[PDB]
Write a protein that holds these residues in place. Structure first.
Motif, mmCIF file in Angstrom:
data_model
loop_
_atom_site.group_PDB
_atom_site.id
_atom_site.type_symbol
_atom_site.label_atom_id
_atom_site.label_comp_id
_atom_site.label_asym_id
_atom_site.label_seq_id
_atom_site.Cartn_x
_atom_site.Cartn_y
_atom_site.Cartn_z
ATOM 1 N N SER F 42 -22.397 -41.372 39.571
ATOM 2 C CA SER F 42 -21.984 -41.660 40.937
ATOM 3 C C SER F 42 -21.911 -40.384 41.774
ATOM 4 N N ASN F 43 -20.929 -39.546 41.439
ATOM 5 C CA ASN F 43 -20.710 -38.231 42.044
ATOM 6 C C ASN F 43 -21.998 -37.475 42.377
ATOM 7 N N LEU F 44 -22.984 -37.539 41.484
ATOM 8 C CA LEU F 44 -24.250 -36.865 41.718
ATOM 9 C C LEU F 44 -25.058 -37.579 42.792
ATOM 10 N N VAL F 45 -25.036 -38.905 42.769
ATOM 11 C CA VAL F 45 -25.792 -39.681 43.737
ATOM 12 C C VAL F 45 -25.249 -39.397 45.126
ATOM 13 N N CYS F 46 -23.942 -39.534 45.294
ATOM 14 C CA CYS F 46 -23.325 -39.300 46.594
ATOM 15 C C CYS F 46 -23.502 -37.865 47.111
ATOM 16 N N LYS F 47 -23.269 -36.878 46.242
ATOM 17 C CA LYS F 47 -23.637 -35.495 46.535
ATOM 18 C C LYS F 47 -25.065 -35.461 47.083
ATOM 19 N N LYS F 48 -25.980 -36.032 46.298
ATOM 20 C CA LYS F 48 -27.409 -36.031 46.602
ATOM 21 C C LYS F 48 -27.706 -36.695 47.925
ATOM 22 N N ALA F 49 -27.131 -37.871 48.128
ATOM 23 C CA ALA F 49 -27.468 -38.680 49.289
ATOM 24 C C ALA F 49 -26.896 -38.078 50.565
ATOM 25 N N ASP F 50 -25.973 -37.133 50.392
ATOM 26 C CA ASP F 50 -25.323 -36.428 51.496
ATOM 27 C C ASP F 50 -24.330 -37.360 52.194
ATOM 28 N N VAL F 51 -23.228 -37.616 51.506
ATOM 29 C CA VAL F 51 -22.163 -38.454 52.017
ATOM 30 C C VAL F 51 -20.833 -37.759 51.730
ATOM 31 N N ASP F 52 -19.838 -37.971 52.596
ATOM 32 C CA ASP F 52 -18.498 -37.437 52.362
ATOM 33 C C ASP F 52 -17.794 -38.135 51.195
ATOM 34 N N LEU F 53 -17.622 -37.397 50.101
ATOM 35 C CA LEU F 53 -16.983 -37.926 48.908
ATOM 36 C C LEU F 53 -15.536 -38.280 49.236
ATOM 37 N N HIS F 54 -14.948 -37.530 50.165
ATOM 38 C CA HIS F 54 -13.566 -37.741 50.574
ATOM 39 C C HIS F 54 -13.344 -39.129 51.179
ATOM 40 N N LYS F 55 -14.423 -39.801 51.553
ATOM 41 C CA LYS F 55 -14.308 -41.114 52.184
ATOM 42 C C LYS F 55 -14.071 -42.253 51.187
ATOM 43 N N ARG F 56 -13.559 -43.373 51.684
ATOM 44 C CA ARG F 56 -13.488 -44.581 50.876
ATOM 45 C C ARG F 56 -14.830 -45.299 50.998
ATOM 46 N N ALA F 57 -15.073 -46.314 50.172
ATOM 47 C CA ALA F 57 -16.276 -47.118 50.346
ATOM 48 C C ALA F 57 -16.240 -47.724 51.727
ATOM 49 N N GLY F 58 -15.039 -48.119 52.128
ATOM 50 C CA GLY F 58 -14.820 -48.891 53.330
ATOM 51 C C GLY F 58 -15.482 -48.418 54.609
ATOM 52 N N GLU F 59 -15.358 -47.127 54.934
ATOM 53 C CA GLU F 59 -15.916 -46.608 56.195
ATOM 54 C C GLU F 59 -17.439 -46.603 56.136
ATOM 55 N N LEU F 60 -17.993 -45.569 55.504
ATOM 56 C CA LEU F 60 -19.400 -45.481 55.100
ATOM 57 C C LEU F 60 -20.414 -46.252 55.964
#
Ligand SMILES: [Mg+2]
Ligand SMILES: [Mg+2]
Ligand SMILES: [Mg+2]
Ligand SMILES: [Mg+2]
Ligand SMILES: [Mg+2]
Ligand SMILES: [Mg+2]
Ligand SMILES: [Mg+2]
Ligand SMILES: [Mg+2]
Ligand SMILES: [Mg+2]
Ligand SMILES: [Mg+2]
Ligand SMILES: [Mg+2]
Ligand SMILES: [Mg+2]
Ligand SMILES: [Mg+2]
Ligand SMILES: [Mg+2]
Ligand SMILES: [Mg+2]
Ligand SMILES: [Mg+2]
Ligand SMILES: [Mg+2]
Ligand SMILES: [Mg+2]
Ligand SMILES: [Mg+2]
Ligand SMILES: [Mg+2]
Ligand SMILES: [Mg+2]
Lengths: 67, 55, 63, 143, 141, 145, 70, 206, 80, 60
Positions: F42-60
């Motif tokens: 997961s962590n790698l995908v989100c890092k990769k995709a360029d998304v704020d890890l600090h966020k919840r799924a909800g906002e996104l």
RNA sequence: UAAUUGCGAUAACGAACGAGACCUUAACCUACUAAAUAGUGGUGCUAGCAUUUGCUGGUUAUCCACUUCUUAGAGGGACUAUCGGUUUCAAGCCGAUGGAAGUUUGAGGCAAUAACAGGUCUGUGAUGCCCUUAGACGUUCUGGGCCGCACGCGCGCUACACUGACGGAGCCAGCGAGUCUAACCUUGGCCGAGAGGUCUUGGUAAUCUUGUGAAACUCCGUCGUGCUGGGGAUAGAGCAUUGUAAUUAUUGCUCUUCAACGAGGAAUUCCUAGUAAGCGCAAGUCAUCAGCUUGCGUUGAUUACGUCCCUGCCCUUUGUACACACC
């Protein structure tokens, strides 16, 4: 405990018996005494002995002691 | 062989699980004698002659 | 709450066939001139001050 | 008066140095950083994502500053923490020989450490200088 | 050289060595100021002798301490001991004696053994358990 | 960090890769309830995709989520190293896949079958409901089934 | 998943007017005022501090602690 | 307090409240006296300390544990239940936070409340399974101070632990909470209830 | 050349345990009475000026069930 | 100290008693500066049954 | 009294074995003899920061000295000392002070007479007798088996979380071992996410691995009570190591899968201070494999300092037709 065995008490008796001039209320000097006047194989036993041939003195100085 | 191995019904956990457990399982040390230990079963016997010759 | 202060004056011994219980004579400090013997739960020595919660009554042997 | 790093507490010094290298940009930073696990005795990657190489770099620097010579093996161990063998008792485990050996080469390219004789790596003539500098800047934040 | 002495401290297996020379007025441990030393919650443990016997006293002396062995507490106890043992030995050779005896006094009256090293030590384990006293679980039958 | 606000934007729960995902949890960890996607992945995908890890799924934002998947269902082009992946060196085409979602259920089965279809002792041993990795079976695993 | 995770406008506004009369304030007090899961509660403590309103009289991890301003 | 600065500088507030008064983490020992006859003696306060960490050989003599600084007694007893065996540095700091917490609410020397919380939950009388032949009823006894203090500490810390367990409040708080409430016990505390009911059962049988 | 043996008569075999067991052995292998054997050895050892001496025989002679005897004289200590 | 730790029992029965034998190795070294005559003299004699003597030389 | 340890009583007096003494380990020496395989101060050569002299380091010999710390020789020290409560003012015991140390100073080693049909012929080229001895119960070679799994029992390991997990950062032990006719312990350099690989290297060792930078632990963050990021069983797929050989998966790494378990009925174990408990480490085994053990040090409590209620043993008293001794 710390009940002194017979070997300790038997020597002590035997020393107070035949050296009451010489000996004292002081174990510190009674230690050095024992060395000259008595063959003993350990420092430890010698101390154990002198400390008690001392205690025995200490109260002869107030009354007698049987034995 | 291995062919029979799997095709064979009568096997796998399901089948055992379904069977009741023998009673011999949950038993005892069985022992058989322990307080007959001082009663020599040799039937024989030394003899005060022999022991005297020896000792 | 008529609390009552009593000063342990003598160690008398351990009762209870277990032994965790010390028989003790205590003296009140809120008017002395009377002593009385009480049974303790915890470890006690001379001069301790028990909270006698019923000024009068006393126990002996335990079992 | 004059100032060392030994004159400044562990955390603040490194965090400023870590911030320093970050504030800078001359570095060298493998590239796999972000997907790598720092040690096999671990569960998740570092939580800094962007960064933490600095934190190590700074730490790695601060450590070889404090002594004669240390290398890959020693640095692997130091950073290595305990590792839950799942249902089995912990043992200690050594850390990544790659993060460190590259922190070692990187910080050297930046001139803070030279591959000392006697083996290992030693605090560069230059490092002493630059380390003692932000060390000084560190106690300036309490001026 | 200048007037000086060396004194130590020992808890468990920590031994804390301390060189006390006449000097400008410092106190560094292994290589750092005493205002760190973290452990930390304890730090007031090693401050202790300084304040125990008055901040001044050190204006005329320098002090180094280095600790080997021991562990992250073992050392805090070892080094306070060597500091305070050192202040009370220096005065023994250099100041006067009634000073030294004044310093011994204020230290012992407080004391977590600042002058005398704690005799306690790990007892051997013996075969039959995972510990010195502890015994392995048994079952009967 | 930052006392935020947001309009109505954020929605709780959302459905991606044929499953359901709780909005009000950190998006790294929210992503995990998909089968075949552990924390590391997961962590790698989100890092990769360029998304704020600090966020919840909800906002996104919905383009963020869209990128998230596209990478998940194709890891090796987006420079993720295969040894990071649950199915290196297939067994037929020898490609490197990373099976996801309902397909991990699908592909555990194929593998199990391939053994049994070949009478391999590991297969047989699966078909019998037993342990296989070579554990003792006298004392352990008693309830199960 | 039983509410506290977000910031519902009226929430932030609650956490301005409601923090007085807090003789004690820490992470674990903000879950007690039926709101804020610890995370977004922790964030508040920095930003209920942004301008006074609370005084840092303690330090760290696990435990935080504040009082109303003066 | 007459400023002094040698080579390696000792901090102002450090230089300050040290050489002055010998007060706690940073709390006063003067004042703080035991509001119940007895317990005095069996509750320390004076000599005063800095932190409740002490290699105290309170062990090898029957009563000398009485001399251990109460606050430190309190901490020692925090460090239990298996996992937290040893870990004094844990506790030591849990107390720090704890004390500060108490002090924030209802004013007061936190250390003073720790005394009052102690004094107020130590049960004055109790019970012990007297024989009388198998059918062992319950005989009322007058419990000693040392046991009154111990049992307080134990009772005190425990309730906080189970309270702190499984939930958002942190030991530091709950520990403070118990005390705070046990200062003048308002039977919203594990400790008081236990005390009370234990003096209820001792009264029920005499 | 590098290895060299000399023999060297022992000064009284009488105060050497090992020498006496092999005596005892060799006694019983010419069929001496169990006691006459041991009971002798103790007596010869004594006259060799020992402070004390003890012989045990264990196992089985002639009868079937195993016995054991002791044969001491003089002074021995046993500890430390 | 050369330690050796063993069960006493030849077999298995009984409470598990453990018994540790030990052997102690003592080593001194003495540095001398003498010519060829004294050395060789000083090595062949001074011998003793139970003490292993070894004499190296050299500045490296 | 820990002790048939003494005191005392006393048809006994005086002694020996065992207990004690003794021996080994852990504690104390600024007293003694020393150390480039231990280390300190000074001085050179030197780096950095301040410069106002300073502060913090580099330099197996650039020299001078020293033995506090380390090492191990020879000595010394403690005898429950001083004092005081107690008691048949006896042995002793309790308290206080002092002391490195005052529970046999703490922990061990050794340990009399006697008993058991305790265990071991599967440690022995120890051994009687019986069995067997060439289609062998000798031996060796190939391959399986001691691990097989409805289930009962015992020692363990990991856990159920917020005194927590996770992630960065702090960063501290002690007992050890280690290669000759040989591949042991491995620093360092590189490549590799990892496990590992490869190039070199110091060590037959207080000299090198190693300051064993071990773990709990300490610091600042992330998560927030949700079977959760607690927990990691089960399982799939890949990559490496030991070995002639790894399938019934030796071990190690990566992804993935993510069970029981929300503190455990009746019961039952262990323990009194640097102890319990938590926590790692060396060593034995070992080609490879510790969830075991033997030792070790690190963090460090609560509660006793009592008694005979339970349980087990010992001692007298007493009964006996038992003495192969209640089997
Ligand atoms: Mg570490
Ligand atoms: Mg770490
Ligand atoms: Mg067993
Ligand atoms: Mg998953
Ligand atoms: Mg298994
Ligand atoms: Mg654990
Ligand atoms: Mg004897
Ligand atoms: Mg003995
Ligand atoms: Mg010396
Ligand atoms: Mg004293
Ligand atoms: Mg038998
Ligand atoms: Mg045999
Ligand atoms: Mg087997
Ligand atoms: Mg951690
Ligand atoms: Mg690769
Ligand atoms: Mg070589
Ligand atoms: Mg879960
Ligand atoms: Mg986990
Ligand atoms: Mg091993
Ligand atoms: Mg085994
Ligand atoms: Mg009779």
């Amino acid at each position: 405990g710390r009940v002194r065995t017979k070997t300790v008490k038997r020597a002590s008796k035997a020393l107070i018996e035949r050296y009451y001039p010489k000996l004292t209320l002081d174990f510190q000097t009674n230690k050095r005494l024992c060395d000259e006047i008595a063959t003993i194989q350990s420092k430890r036993l010698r101390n154990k002995i002198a400390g008690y041939t001392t205690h025995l003195m200490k109260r002869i100085q107030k009354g007698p002691v049987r034995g | 062989g291995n062919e029979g191995a799997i095709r064979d019904k009568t096997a796998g956990r399901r089948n055992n699980r379904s069977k009741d457990v023998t009673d011999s399982a949950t038993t005892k040390k069985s022992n058989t004698r322990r307080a007959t230990d001082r009663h020599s079963r040799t039937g024989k016997t030394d003899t005060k002659k022999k022991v005297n010759q020896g000792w | 709450t008529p609390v009552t202060l009593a000063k342990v004056i003598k160690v008398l011994g351990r009762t209870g066939s277990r032994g965790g219980v010390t028989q003790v004579r205590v003296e009140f400090l809120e008017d002395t001139s009377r002593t009385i013997v009480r049974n303790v739960k915890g470890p006690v020595r001379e001069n301790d001050i028990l909270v006698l919660m019923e000024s009068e009554r006393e126990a002996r042997r335990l079992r | 008066p004059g100032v060392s790093v030994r004159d400044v507490a562990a955390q603040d010094f490194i965090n400023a140095y870590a911030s320093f290298l970050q504030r800078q940009g001359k570095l060298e930073v493998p590239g796999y950083v972000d997907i790598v696990k720092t040690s096999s005795g671990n569960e998740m990657p570092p939580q800094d994502a962007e960064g933490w190489f600095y934190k190590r770099a700074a730490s790695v620097a601060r450590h070889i500053y404090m002594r004669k010579q240390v290398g890959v093996g020693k640095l692997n161990k130091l950073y290595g923490g305990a590792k839950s063998r799942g249902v089995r008792p912990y043992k200690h485990i050594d850390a990544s020989g790659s993060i460190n050996r590259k922190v070692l080469q990187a910080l050297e390219k930046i001139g803070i450490v030279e591959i000392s004789p006697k083996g290992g790596r030693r605090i560069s003539e230059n490092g002493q200088r630059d380390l003692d500098r932000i060390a000084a800047q560190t106690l300036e934040e309490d001026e | 050289a200048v007037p000086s002495v060396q004194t130590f401290g020992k808890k468990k297996s920590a031994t804390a060595v301390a060189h006390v020379k006449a000097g400008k007025g410092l106190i560094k441990v292994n290589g750092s100021p005493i205002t760190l030393v973290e452990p930390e919650i304890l730090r007031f443990k090693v401050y202790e002798p300084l304040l125990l016997v008055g901040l001044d006293k050190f204006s005329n002396i320098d002090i180094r301490v280095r600790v080997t062995g021991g562990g992250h507490v073992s050392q805090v106890y070892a080094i306070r001991q060597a500091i305070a043992k050192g202040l009370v030995a220096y005065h023994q050779k250099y100041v006067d004696e009634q000073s030294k005896n004044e310093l011994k006094k204020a230290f012992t009256s407080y004391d977590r053994t600042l002058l005398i090293a704690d005799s306690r030590r790990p007892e051997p384990k013996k075969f039959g358990g995972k510990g010195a006293r502890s015994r392995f679980q048994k079952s009967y039958r | 960090s930052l006392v935020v606000q947001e309009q109505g934007s954020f929605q709780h729960i959302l459905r991606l890769l044929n499953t359901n995902v709780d909005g009000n949890i950190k998006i790294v960890y929210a992503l995990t309830t998909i089968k075949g996607v552990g924390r590391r992945y997961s962590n790698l995908v989100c890092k990769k995709a360029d998304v704020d890890l600090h966020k919840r799924a909800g906002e996104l934002t919905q383009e963020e989520l869209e990128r998230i998947v596209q990478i998940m269902q194709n890891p090796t082009h987006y420079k993720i190293p295969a040894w990071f992946l649950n199915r290196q060196n297939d067994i037929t085409d020898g490609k490197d896949y990373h099976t996801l979602a309902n397909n991990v259920e699908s592909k555990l089965r194929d593998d199990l079958e391939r053994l049994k279809k070949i009478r391999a002792h590991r297969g047989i041993r699966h078909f019998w409901g037993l342990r296989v990795r070579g554990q003792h079976t006298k004392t352990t695993g008693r309830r199960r089934a | 998943a039983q509410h506290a995770v977000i910031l519902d406008q009226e929430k932030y506004d609650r956490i301005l007017k409601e923090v007085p009369t807090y003789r004690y304030v820490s992470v674990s007090v903000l879950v007690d005022r039926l709101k804020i899961g610890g995370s977004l509660a922790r964030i508040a403590l920095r930003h209920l501090e942004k301008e006074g309103i609370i005084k840092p009289i303690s330090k760290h991890s696990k435990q935080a602690i504040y009082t109303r301003a003066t | 307090f007459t400023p002094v600065v040698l080579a390696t500088p000792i901090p102002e507030e450090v230089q300050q409240a040290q050489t002055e008064i010998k007060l706690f983490n940073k709390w006063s020992f003067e004042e703080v006296e035991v509001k119940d006859a007895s317990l005095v003696d069996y509750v320390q306060v004076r000599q005063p300390i800095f932190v409740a960490h002490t290699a105290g050989r309170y062990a090898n003599k029957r009563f000398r544990k009485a001399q251990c600084p109460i606050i430190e007694r309190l901490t020692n007893s925090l460090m239990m239940n298996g996992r937290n065996n040893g870990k004094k540095l844990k506790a030591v700091r849990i107390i720090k936070h704890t004390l500060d917490i108490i002090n924030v609410l209802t004013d007061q020397n936190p250390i003073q409340v720790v005394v009052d919380a102690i004094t107020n939950t130590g049960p004055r009388e109790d019970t012990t399974r007297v024989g009388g032949g198998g059918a062992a009823r319950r005989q009322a006894v007058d419990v000693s101070p040392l046991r009154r203090v111990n049992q307080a500490i134990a009772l005190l810390t425990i309730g906080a632990r189970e309270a702190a367990f499984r939930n958002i409040k942190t030991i530091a708080e709950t520990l403070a909470e118990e005390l705070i409430n046990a200062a003048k016990g308002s039977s919203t505390s594990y400790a008081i209830k236990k005390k009370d009911e234990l003096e209820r059962v001792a009264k029920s049988n005499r | 050349g590098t290895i060299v043996l000399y023999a060297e008569r022992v000064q009284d075999r009488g105060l050497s345990a090992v020498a006496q067991a092999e005596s005892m052995k060799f006694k019983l292998l010419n069929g001496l009475a169990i006691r006459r054997a041991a009971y002798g050895v103790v007596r010869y050892v004594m006259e060799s000026g020992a402070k004390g001496c003890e012989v045990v025989v264990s196992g089985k002679l002639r009868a079937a069930r195993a016995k054991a005897m002791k044969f001491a004289d003089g002074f021995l200590i046993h500890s430390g | 100290v050369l330690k050796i730790s063993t069960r006493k029992t030849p077999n298995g029965e009984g409470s598990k008693t453990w018994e540790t034998y030990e052997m102690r190795i003592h080593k001194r070294y003495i540095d001398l500066e003498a010519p060829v005559q004294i050395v060789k003299r000083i090595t062949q004699i001074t011998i003793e049954p139970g003490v292993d003597v070894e004499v190296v030389v050299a500045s490296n």
